[PDB]
Amino acid sequence: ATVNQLVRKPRARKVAKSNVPALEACPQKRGVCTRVYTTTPKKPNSALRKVCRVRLTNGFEVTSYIGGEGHNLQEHSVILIRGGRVKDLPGVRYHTVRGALDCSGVKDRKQARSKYGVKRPKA
Amino acid sequence: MVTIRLARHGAKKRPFYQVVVADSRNARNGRFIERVGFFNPIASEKEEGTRLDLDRIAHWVGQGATISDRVAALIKEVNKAA
Amino acid sequence: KIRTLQGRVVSDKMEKSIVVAIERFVKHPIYGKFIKRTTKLHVHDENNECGIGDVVEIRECRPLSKTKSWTLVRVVEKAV
């Protein structure tokens, strides 16, 4: 506190971490699907969450949530991840981009539509 | 050698020319010893467009600076004006 | 006329040479406290007159050695 104590040993700032360490300060990374599966979330929630397991180009082997209603993913599919965690699934730090490189968009969607990779329907 | 030459510092299609005392081995828009005036070809009427500090140009020539071929027309012009 | 500096003899165990710590008293760039700092210099004295505890005054010259570019001018406060 005192002015001799801050000369001999200055104030030190806490080096903050990141919660998306596999992106490595990149916006998106291309990965290869290795297992598609479902998972029940933690309590109080109850569903069957659709989430895959991706091998990233930089070498990291992470799980990645597949958003929206229904998809077309298999093993050995090549998709693009973005970050942002799903809270109620412990261990999922990444989302997938719908509409990028193997993943098709959500079918029959008309609202919040850019988020789900759907071309604009003409009416 | 030390030279008095022009330097293109303006926008595109609108050239502005800082005349600078420089060592002649540097780049055009690079290192210079002394800014000794300017020249504007896209100058309007009823204003100034060509101003040269002649107290320094006479200094550096007697020191031994050369003069650009284009500056030597601007020294020809202002010695019509006064 | 000449940019000169006082100092204090710290060791004179190498011959025709003395090492001189020059105290300076400079403020901190954050806190504003004043802090004593210490600058040693290898000084060339000819004729080997200096001993420990002796204040001395020095001046800068051409390099005499690998670490030695200062030479004294006069001496004050030899004794204890």
Add this chain to the structure above:
Amino acid sequence: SMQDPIADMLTRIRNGQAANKAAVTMPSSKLKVAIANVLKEEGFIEDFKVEGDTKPELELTLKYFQGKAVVESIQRVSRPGLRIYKRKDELPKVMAGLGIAVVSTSKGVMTDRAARQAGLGGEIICYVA
């Protein structure tokens, strides 16, 4: 040990104003009279006196106004652990000009208002607001 005999002068004022003391006594000095002279000409204390031959003893007649202390706030600044010097355009304002800041300039200790006029800065002693 007493490391700071000027902070005790301001403390004994600050403590006596809260105790409604008619006067505060303290040991005297040359620097304490020059501070207590700025404290009387600016108007914060009514009087000051010094008595004693071998060891003098200063005595400040403290000032009150309508039931409350005239010295509303009094603070040490340039303490022995941290010295404060300001050039003549870096001099502080206390209470936007409605309170003085006693400064030690080379023509004697004066206030900050008198030291801007002289065109010379100095060590700040205290804020008497």
Add this chain to the structure above:
Amino acid sequence: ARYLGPKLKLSRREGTDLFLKSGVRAIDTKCKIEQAPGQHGARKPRLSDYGVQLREKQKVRRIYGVLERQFRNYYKEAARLKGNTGENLLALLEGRLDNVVYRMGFGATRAEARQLVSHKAIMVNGRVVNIASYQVSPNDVVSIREKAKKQSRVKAALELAEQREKPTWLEVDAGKMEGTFKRKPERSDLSADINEHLIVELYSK
């Protein structure tokens, strides 16, 4: 870059007339002015701090027709100039060229004063100027040029321009169709129900 939706649909959200129509016919005969637009328009919920800071800021954009990144820069230029920031802001809006065409009455509304400017039919100092956002220093004369000085809508709008309360600080003619920007407006001669300080406190976070 322009609002191309319904005009009186913006007056209903704010609450009074923003004068976006020429006003030959009465506004309480054309739109239900004291109800918000939409299905849930009659309900007036209680509005918060961020509501009334934003509603005041939208109200002064929507009178004059400026969009946000251009209206953001009017705040950083009102603040840069010397003196009172929020009163500098309205003097910038009142220096636009499509506003002088409306204060001199050459157009019906501030958008038809804009399209006189937008289609090269307005001189400033005897020079054709196209932009709705030309900032006008004093003594700069501004006029209908000879190309459009026989149009059926300009003198038809001067019949409306007499009916509006005349600005003090300008000058204009009826046959010569020239106008002089004599000074920039004092704040008291602007309308006094614009709460300019709320726009300041919205940006000054």
Add this chain to the structure above:
Amino acid sequence: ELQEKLIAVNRVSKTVKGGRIFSFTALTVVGDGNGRVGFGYGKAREVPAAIQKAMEKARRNMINVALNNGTLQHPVKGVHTGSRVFMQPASEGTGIIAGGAMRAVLEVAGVHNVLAKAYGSTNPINVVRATIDGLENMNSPEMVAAKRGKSVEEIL
């Protein structure tokens, strides 16, 4: 002339033998448009009966503030129990740069141009007390002329 603002309204409770029993705290502030500023605090079973009592208790225990033109006279601080508060004079053009419950007590006060900051807690109950505490010990250019037996021009 007494303009009024209510700041916060919050639901409290109390356990009994039967169960929990609810009630409503309502926090206001008043002021006319110059130095007289006040606030009140009422609590009741139902909200219109509790904004009633706080606006009633606000119309008394009003206190004077020696205003300058539309602003402060000098920098000042004010504490009450969680909230240290700074507020600073300003010039015509910047508006109330304040926030929270500190904003509302500043509007009805009659002051229009402040720079300000809230440190410590920002409980809305205590921070209206730390800003009245700061306004009440703000001293005029003539109360300091009276205090040292002086004229104002010798103080500037």
Add this chain to the structure above:
RNA sequence: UAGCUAGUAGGUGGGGUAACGGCUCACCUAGGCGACGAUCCCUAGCUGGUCUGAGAGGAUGACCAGCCACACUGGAACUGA
């Protein structure tokens, strides 16, 4: 990461360089650096600036301009101001 250093630290003389100098060599002396962080490991082009903030600061060094380093990798000289 608490000890590091033998051309190492200084002295005298020969050579050497455009020039001062352990720059090199012979000889003597036994020093030199370090807790105000030597040595060691990890990282890194530097500034004018840029971004953020009321400020103090914190983060940063892309374009433009100044200086340094390299020219496939590791070495070396030649010619020449």
Add this chain to the structure above:
RNA sequence: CCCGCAGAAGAAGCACCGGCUAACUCCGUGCCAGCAGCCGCGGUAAUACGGAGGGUGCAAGCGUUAAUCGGAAUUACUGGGCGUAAAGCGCACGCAGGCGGUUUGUUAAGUCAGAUGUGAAAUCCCCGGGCUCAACCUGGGAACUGCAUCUGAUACUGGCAA
């Protein structure tokens, strides 16, 4: 840059609407399908999921992710704390270090004042000038908190002396 002609023609999307936070209703599912920045929503009347109508915010752009600083007085020099919330060494002695009562003289290192030499240009700012406006470009300043040097002040701190 300008003059004309024909023609409203060839030219609007994206997010959001439970609270934070500007913006609300019917129908579909039924702890499923889904949402989600935090708190939370969904188990049959969901202003929170999906579609609709309506609305709000920005607009040739709007979102999302990544990275930085701010809010964060949450490493606090400015500008925090340690009886019980995290935080006084179990107690002491004491070297370096930090700090040091009172008078006089002298000194002028810190301190202070003025002048001089440097602090590239660009950029930032101020007042102008030119591209129809703007962005952009340029003229003059101001600035560059610094560093050295010379002369002056001596209140205070340091040095020497009584």
